[model samples]
Target chain A: MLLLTPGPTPIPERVQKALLRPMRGHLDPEVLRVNRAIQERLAALFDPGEGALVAALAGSGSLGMEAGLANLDRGPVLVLVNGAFSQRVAEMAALHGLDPEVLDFPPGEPVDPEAVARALKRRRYRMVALVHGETSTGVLNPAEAIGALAKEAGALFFLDAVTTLGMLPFSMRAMGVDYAFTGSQKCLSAPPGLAPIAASLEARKAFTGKRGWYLDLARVAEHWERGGYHHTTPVLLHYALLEALDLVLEEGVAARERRAREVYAWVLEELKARGFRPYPKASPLPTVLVVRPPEGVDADRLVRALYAEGVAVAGGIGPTRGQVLRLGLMGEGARREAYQAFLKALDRALAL
Target chain B: MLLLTPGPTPIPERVQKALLRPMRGHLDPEVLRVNRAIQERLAALFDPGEGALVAALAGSGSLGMEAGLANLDRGPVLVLVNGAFSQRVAEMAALHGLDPEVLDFPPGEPVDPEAVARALKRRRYRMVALVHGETSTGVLNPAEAIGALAKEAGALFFLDAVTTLGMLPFSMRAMGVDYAFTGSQKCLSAPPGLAPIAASLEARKAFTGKRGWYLDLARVAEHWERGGYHHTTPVLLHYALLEALDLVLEEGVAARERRAREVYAWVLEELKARGFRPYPKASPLPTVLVVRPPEGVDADRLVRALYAEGVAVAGGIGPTRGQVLRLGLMGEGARREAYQAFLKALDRALAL
Candidate 1:
């Protein structure tokens, strides 16, 4: 089946077969060795020279957000909310008892660097949170510019690079992002159970505070770094991720970027051909595309029709519900053949 | 390599292959189908008819204890602590601000049912927590009798069956255990990333007041029940569990028990021959054998020497550290061949 949803993208047969392998204990020396290798591979993916990257056994991209917020010792966190995901970061910060202040931006517009700078100048936040790519409206925020503002304000910069990390350009060091989190299921085309996180040494130091035990980044790091068995690692997911990373590197990042761009362009052209208009056209990433449904068409019904035709695009999520259709064009699903098949299915559904 | 540790027992190659399969999204129709199958299989394992059994995406077995405490809404929790794992439950209860009173049985002794009843008589608690098989000292608590007492006292009974779920004689329904949690990496032989939890309708009701988002059992149940995307099910690990459960059922629980008994007998016989005695002789489970070191042999040195011989065993955990050596006869390692090999290795180590 065509899995065009944002995550759990269709994987190669080899990777799919890997999932069927038997389970092993996380503490098994072989498992730990693989885990260490995965950590190193993730570190290389983030490429923040001297800092560390860790993986957690939670599924949602949101868990990473929770880990980031929960680990911060000093956090009157500042959140920039342009869509549902950013709003979630704000809510999560509040849940952790942090004083979270959200700067609202229009859903269709990218976050303005100047506005973020002005806000940073006005208040001293312990942490500034931003969504690098808002899948809700297909709006990609300028995280590099915002990260600079946060750094200038002496606040740790945390980014939810969930939707952007592998598909688009990202550099934790270059962007001055102190903490960044991504999921294996998205652009990496790995399974959906692990959250891959990277942190600057300064951010890692913040984990000394009293956070709840399970997701404590510092404690997790300690156990992982010291080779102590604090908790079980998701062994099989780690295996899948290693293979997924292998595929990503095999194609090379440049080729993967080109594939994403091609798939996104095809999606846009097909939607335009069907008289659909793109939503939030400015600075949209190739990873996800949001388009307005036909005037008389019910968004949910359109999604259903697409699903019936073996295409599985999603209806708009959160506030964008009933207004837009979100199409994923990343990972293995970004193949030209898959895009062509999806276009064919859409054409048939639109005609009906 | 010999892995005679209490947990993370040696998983066979067949199970490991299942874990390496590619993951589908938790929301995918096929994955939701698999999730339902797994829940039913786990319920059968627990023998809890019509109970809610779901998986949590955390690594440590301790997360299950935290989930139990966090989900219980009622006033106080009564915990039975005889070893490290049980002590962890008490600590988690306190961490969640619950009024947790512990009935401590001395190390190497089964928790007294009379004491549990008296504690329940003294005060009402929302839940009574105990460990079915304490890995710390290889003592099997009388869960069936204790569960009856807790039920009669009007408290929901929760059991940490992490190490015993797939290896020992345990029936959640027959034992009247309202809530039980197990880890995948233990006897189930799945990878270490997921916690399989079974809860009675009463326990599920208690989760209405769940304090945390990630571990919210109600939310988890709803998602798993509706076939909606709960947090990303560790896709590949789920695959591993499916295959692992098949292996377990094929072996049959009773046969599994016999294997465990045979291995434990071998270990005990060897220890007795070497003038070492079993700790907690009255309530020992066949899965984990706790043996005192010989008069001249140091427990740590014995463990290190065994390790040098390519055999792995655990030294005493928690308060029993350096005094007792815990030898695990679990899963594939519980076979007759492995037991003979272990004896040879132990003899060589002791001779050294």
Candidate 2:
């Protein structure tokens, strides 16, 4: 399948092969060693400093969002919603009984950092949630700036880096982000079953006091760090992730960023050349490209045509509904040949 | 590694191969198909036409007990505590704020059905809980008879069949069991993630008002059955389970039961020859064999010595600790070779 959607990208053969090894008990010595190694590696990636990295069971990028909100000690979360994914985060917070204040921006626009600062000043929030990369509209919010603002206001910052973690340079410590989560399938190139989450010391302390028993970030940290049990580490998936992380490091973040930028630029240029107007945007995410359908063309029809050609791209989700098509150039699948094939298919389907 | 533990028995190479396949999205059509297939297969295994099979986000077997307790709405849970696992169930129920009454039985003896009936008669209970196979003491309770008592008393009978599901002929419907939980690693020979649960409609309906969001059985059932998006299905582990279940069915439940009995009988005879005594007066479970340590030998030291000989047996958990050595012959690991090797290692360890 041409998996050009956000997650569950095509895994390399080597990583796929690694998943086939014999099973080990969750408490097995070898499995615990791998868990510790992954934690250390992720700690470096998330840079929790002396804090903890808690792995949530469900890789639903939303699980981390829920966990972060549920673990927070205080109420009143300020969610900056630039696109669909950010809005979902706000919705999850509300579902968990948190009084959430949403600051929404138009599609393809970054959440105003000044607005976030103003909101923080108005009321004391436990957290300010921002989506680093909104895959729906290809909008990348100013996470580092917004996180810094939240930190200055004494509010923990939670960022959904699900769509950008491995492909983009998302340093939680450097950005002053307290709690950040990423799915294995997205840029990690691992299977879609684990969500790697890193919590700041403050966030960890907050989580320890008030958290659900199952998704208790503090319990996960204690069990993994102190209890020695480490719970049920998905052994085969961890193996795949180890290999995938190796590939990501080999590719280098700079090279990956460059590749993503090139792909997005190419898509924009090609669509414009075909007289298909792209979504008006100044700074969009490098990985996802959102475009308006050609005049009198249905976005759903376009997506169906692409699917018929054995190419899979997503139609607009949430508010963008029938207005846009989202194309993802991600993970190992972000190759020139795949891009060329996708563009060629799009051109043929549009009769360009 | 030689995994002689009651749960997480050694998985065969072929089953391990299934786990190595490329990870699929939780909402992927292929994964949905697999999910449906597994549910149907498990439903058949449980043979509960009125029951629905659900998968919980994998954790230790204890989590399943928690799921059962946390899901029940009207519960003065009458738990039959025969060993460590049963005690854990009672603790979990209490933790969930249920009025739990413990029908305590000695470690080796099966719980008295009359006592369970009397407890139910004394007070109205929404649920009755017991461990079908108490691996802690190698005792298999008379689940069928106890379930009958619960059914007659108008309470949902829940069984922790983690170690008994595939090793024996456990039919939930036939036994009048309302809810039952099993893990992949135990009798299924799958890896140690993914709890396979079967709950009767009456018991599942009780979860409509559960306090914990994640453990709500009604929502889990809806997501699995109606919504078609029940958490990340642990794709690789499910793949392993599919392969493992195939092996289980191919071996046939009757044949598997015979093998377990033969292995247990062989170990018992060998133990008798070597002057070792069984823990309980009644016939124990086929999968786990609990025996008193020889006069001067330390159980922990014996476990360590056996581990050195490439066999990993566990000492008695909870209250029976330091006194009993619990040897498990579960799933594919319950073969003639494993039994012989375990006996030989035990004899050598005792001599030392």
Candidate 3:
């Protein structure tokens, strides 16, 4: 079955073999070394969040969000909300008992940096968060602009790169993001269950107080740095991550991006011809597209009909639940043959 | 190489294959169905926590601890600390900004319920937490005794079953435990990265007022029950857990426990005859054995020498570091021949 959701993208054979690799004790020197290598590689892989410590945590990206916001016990987090993912940042902050300001823009529109700048100027927030790519609506926020304003506000610039990290050239550090996290299963093609996170030395100051223990950056860093005991490390996922990154790097991310660009444009041509419209964007995200279902087409039913033909696409979440379809165009699914197959499946499902 | 450390104990090929199974998106009906089945089966596998809500979380046991303790946002928690794991409960409490009253006991000894009872008489607490099986020195804390005190004191009871859950029969509900959690890599024989947790309706009362975002039970239950999406579900880990549980149930927990009882005794006899001694206890935990090193032998060096022969055992952690060798006698390592091989590796390493 085809899995075309934003995260948990297709896994390659090389990555699958890595999972079959011997499951080692968390402290096994071999596994420990792999984790350390993964830390350095993840930093290099995504332009380590502003050159901060990169930690591969054991849970999903939501845990990554919790780790980023919970550590900044200082107070008042400001999340730039444009879609479900960004809105989640506010929910996480509220869970920590912090009244975070969720500055909202329309889901399909880019976050206005000027609006965020004004909010930053209004309060002393410990964290200013943004989603690098909002797959929910196919909008790429102005991470660099938002990040610059966050810097001026004396707040840790946090970014969520779950969808964009490997799909594009994202250097959170270069974008002025102080801390960020990405999932292994997205564009990198690893299996789920691992969140690779990064935090800069400036972001390190926030780690001084007691943070969420499993998500504790200082302890996670110590375990990686000193080869000491921390949590029973999820070594299997690290092995898979190592292989995924190795394969990705070996493929030359640049080459993959070029293919993605050419093929994304090609794939969307089918959408245009078929009467399905994507959420308006200047230049749509190369990895995920939020397509508005054809007139009179029930989005959920259309999703199921497409699935009946061996293609899986996600129905929009929350407000867009029945309004749109979210498709992850990363990994093997981005292939010309696969895209063409999906187009055929689309035609069959819509009875066109 | 055989894993002699308690967790991640050797994962059988059946369970390993599950990890390589196709990666399913969180909302895929099969994936969602498996999760619901997992929830109910987990509830049935370990006695449900007296009408508690049972759910599987993405992350290792440590995150389970965070999910367990961090959710009790109420203050002045009482943690029955006997070893490193127990101490962590208190540390997690503090991370949430609550200064818990840590009731101390010697690391190698059982938690003195008399002391716990006395403490209950002295003050009020939001929760009373204990480690069911202390891995540091291989002692099983008195779950029933400590739990009763917690119930009598009108406080919530939390149990950490990382070492004992599947190795021995445990009924958190029967033991009066309001909440409990176990790691998958232990007796479940799955790779690390998932924590199976339970919370009873009685325990659910504490779910008010901003616990933790990722570990929050209400959202987790909603996700599991109604197919609501929460965290990026670690679908692969769940498949592994499901397969591991199936293998374990087929083996019959009763028969496994009886076999473990004999092997544990036989294992302790081998070490006693060789001049190593387990820290004195009424009876050692059946799954893990913590033996004191022979005089004049460095524990770390001995562990490496044993590993040199392809038998992997762990050295002591924290206060017990340099003092003992913690051996896992679960799953594959439970065989008599394995203990024999460990003996040969030990003599060679020790030059005895």
What overall lDDT goes with each candidate model?
Answer: 0.78, 0.76, 0.80
Query: Taking the tens digit of each residue's C-alpha lDDT, what string does model 2 give over B197-283?
Result: 877877777765444554557657766776443344456677778788888888888898898898888778888887779997685
lDDT by residue for model 2 (A89-187), tens: 887677566789998888778888888778888999888889999987888888889878987888888889887877888688789888888777778
Could you tell which candidate, 2 or 3, scores higher by TM-score?
3
TM-score of chain A of 1: 0.96
Identify the candidate with maximal TM-score.
Answer: 3
Q: Is the docking of candidate 1 incorrect, acceptable, medium or high quality?
A: acceptable
The DockQ-based order of candidates, best leading, equals 3, 1, 2
TM-score of chain B of each: 0.96, 0.96, 0.95
- The DockQ value obtained for model 3 is 0.73
Q: Candidate 2: lDDT over CA atoms?
A: 0.76
* Candidate 1 C-alpha lDDT tens digits along B273-317: 898888875789678889888888888888889878878788888
Which stretches in model 2 have alpha-carbon errors above 4 Å?
A53-62, A209-211, A271-282, A295-297, A300-308, A320-324, A344-352, B51-64, B210-219, B227-232, B280-283, B321-323, B344-352
